[PDB]
């Protein structure tokens, strides 16, 4: 996400700027609020006199949240197999504000990163699947081969 | 090695040079579940492989419907992502700054606890030693709570600490109600409530209304129901990257991301300071009390095709006026858009009955204007500028002559002493008359008790409209 | 000196590591000399070998969306 540009100097550095762009504004002392609330998922062991208040804008928000260390370590309830009465601990390492998001949070959990591999190698397969009418061909070899079809599938 | 033929004889990735090692992944995994239905046909196996992620769809999205939606991480989801949106809106550009402090809700009392007095304290730190008792330090205007009160002792000695709190940095400590606040348990049942002045008279509450009449109460404004964060996923409307993800919504209202209108009302503290670099704007629906661009859901109905609201209730107009007159902020909804208003910004002071003599049934109405909170705002300000313009000038060589010119010419920038200015002008220049009395103290002299006197204009509140027909006129 | 409007590329493009490191390096020149880099794909990008079986190819978007 960087533009290729020219180093700058007395000639004229003119760059294509997809963007389109805004604007900005400024005042006084800076009407200064003051987010107060649990924002973390425990309970900080240092009093309240010497811990900090950091300060965010637009820019530095991505920065605020990776400093942090969101680690919310929580017990749930185990939907990837047949039993109801299981749970299954998580993991979680947030950074980013797209680490709420289920790419992220199923890429944090290895019994979901088994998953989308087993997703992705499905959806590798269906490409080459129906152009080349040789398959089926062979899948039924491997109905008249079974010895040597479950022999390969531990591998 | 037939399974090493089968990529030799693939011509797109054969002779072992980029892929070879995730396609052979693809094919062994989809021959150990091919035995629940034997077949033989490639277009067959295109459907058999999205039969496959149909069925893998329902194990994942079933178990991401599980690692969110717990009470450790929404609650800390809405807690953040409520911030993004009170960044996302308020324009940084235009002189604005916000600061972010970790607190828990159990901490804090006990910090208040901690302290012999208030001011002591280690909030009395954050919010005025650090901020608006320090030389050149950016002072405070409000403090987002990002709380949910109860009516309990341990809730009511929180904002009597945060009253007095409030009184000393001038600025207004605004959070939010529970559902338990209103004693329902369950929040979608507040319009069946018939009458609302009935349940604040109850005994429960006598913490509650002995904090409104308290002077230090004019400090705390309590804001709206909830507001919609995120809306739920969708393979179509808001996909994922190298995913479909249908987040299945149950009965259940819980579990969408709703986060708290303290966020959601200092939006419009910020984006009236944005324009206008003041605020008392923040109860118009189109006068800058206006939440825009909520989240929606369209969801399927029992036939119809409605939408979530994305406040959790249709806050009706009588319900809001009897909110108004019991302190509270509250957030209508506009009923089929995303968007949505605050009428009256009513803190949750009470205004005190005055006797009927001449000076009385004036002070009732002198009264009246400091509990409505958009009027501490215009002079929260003028404790704000005034402690930073006067601190500047200690050691100078003044007189009393030139305080009373310093600050008469000073606040006449602010003040616009006209019947009906334009628009821009009522808001640049909040104040309408100023009168400003300096003092001596005698004893030690060069103290000087001066008293600055302000009076704002008047918004839009009401009206009757008695219909009839005249006939011929 | 007169400026350059646009680059012919006279390439037969595969989807391989050394073309695509080679447009990653002519789109970051191409924004510099603000010239668009015009050249050629090959019938190996699309995964044929033999290019007169390209309108046989059924479904040209999930072709795309491979590792």
């Known amino acids: 996400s960087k533009e290729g540009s020219v180093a700058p100097k007395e000639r004229i550095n003119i760059k294509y700027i997809p963007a389109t762009g805004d604007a900005q504004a400024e005042v006084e002392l800076p009407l200064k609020t003051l987010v107060v609330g649990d924002f973390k998922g425990h309970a900080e062991q240092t009093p309240l006199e010497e811990r900090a208040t950091v300060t965010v804008d637009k820019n530095n928000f991505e920065a605020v949240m990776r400093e942090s260390e969101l680690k919310i370590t929580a017990t749930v309830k185990n939907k990837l197999t047949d039993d109801e009465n299981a749970e299954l601990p998580v993991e979680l390492n947030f950074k980013s504000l797209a680490d709420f998001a289920p790419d992220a949070v199923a890429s944090q959990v290895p019994e979901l990163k088994k998953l989308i591999e087993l997703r992705e190698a499905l959806v590798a397969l269906k490409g080459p699947l129906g152009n080349i009418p040789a398959f089926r061909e062979r899948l039924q070899s491997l109905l008249n081969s079974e010895e040597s079809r479950e022999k390969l599938l531990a591998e | ?473």
């Open chain 2, 1 to 473: 090695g037939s399974l090493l033929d089968e990529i030799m004889a693939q011509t797109r990735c054969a002779p072992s040079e980029e892929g070879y090692d995730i396609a052979k992944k693809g094919v062994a995994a989809f021959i150990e579940n091919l035995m629940g239905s034997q077949h033989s046909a490639e277009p067959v196996n295109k459907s058999l492989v999205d039969q496959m992620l149909v069925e893998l769809d329902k194990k994942i999205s079933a178990q991401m419907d599980e690692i969110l939606h717990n009470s450790q991480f929404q609650a800390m989801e809405s807690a953040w992502r409520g911030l993004k949106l009170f960044v996302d809106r308020t324009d940084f550009r235009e002189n604005n700054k916000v600061e972010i402090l970790h607190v828990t809700k159990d901490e804090l009392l006990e910090d208040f606890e901690f302290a012999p007095e208030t001011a002591q304290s280690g909030l009395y730190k954050h919010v005025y030693s650090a901020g608006y008792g320090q030389f050149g330090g950016e002072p405070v205007g409000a403090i987002i709570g990002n709380y949910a009160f109860t009516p309990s002792t341990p809730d009511m000695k929180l904002l009597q600490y945060m009253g007095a709190l409030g009184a000393m940095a001038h600025a207004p400590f605004i959070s939010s109600v529970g559902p338990e606040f209103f004693g329902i348990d369950s929040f979608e049942e507040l319009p069946n409530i018939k009458d609302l002045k009935s349940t604040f008279e109850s005994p429960k509450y006598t913490k509650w209304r002995s904090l409104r009449e308290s002077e230090d109460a004019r400090y705390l404004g309590l804001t709206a129901p909830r507001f919609l964060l995120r809306v739920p996923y969708d393979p179509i409307e808001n996909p994922v990257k190298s995913f479909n993800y249908a987040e299945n919504v149950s009965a259940s209202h819980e579990h969408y991301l709703w986060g708290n209108t303290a966020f959601a009302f200092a939006t419009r503290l910020t984006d009236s300071f944005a324009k206008y670099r003041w605020c008392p704007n923040i109860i118009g629906p189109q006068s800058g009390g206006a939440v825009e661009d909520l989240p929606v859901h369209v969801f399927e109905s029992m036939g119809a095709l409605q939408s979530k609201i994305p406040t959790e209730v249709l806050i009706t107009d009588r319900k809001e006026f009897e909110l108004a007159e019991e302190g509270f902020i509250a957030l209508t909804m506009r009923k089929g858009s995303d968007n949505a208003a605050f009428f009256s910004a009513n803190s949750i002071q009470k205004p005190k009955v005055f006797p009927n003599t001449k000076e009385g049934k004036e002070a009732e109405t002198n009264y009246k204007l400091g509990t409505q909170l958009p009027y501490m705002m215009i002079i929260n300000r003028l404790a704000h500028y005034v402690k930073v313009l006067q601190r500047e000038q200690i050691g100078a060589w003044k007189e009393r002559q030139d305080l009373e010119r310093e600050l008469n010419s000073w606040i006449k920038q602010y003040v616009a002493d006209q019947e009906n200015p334009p628009a821009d002008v009522r808001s640049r220049r909040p104040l309408r008359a100023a009168r400003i009395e300096v003092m001596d103290v005698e004893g030690n002299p060069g103290w000087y008790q001066v008293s600055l006197s302000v009076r704002p204009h008047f918004k839009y509140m009401g009206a009757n409209f008695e219909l009839s027909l005249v006939g011929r006129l």
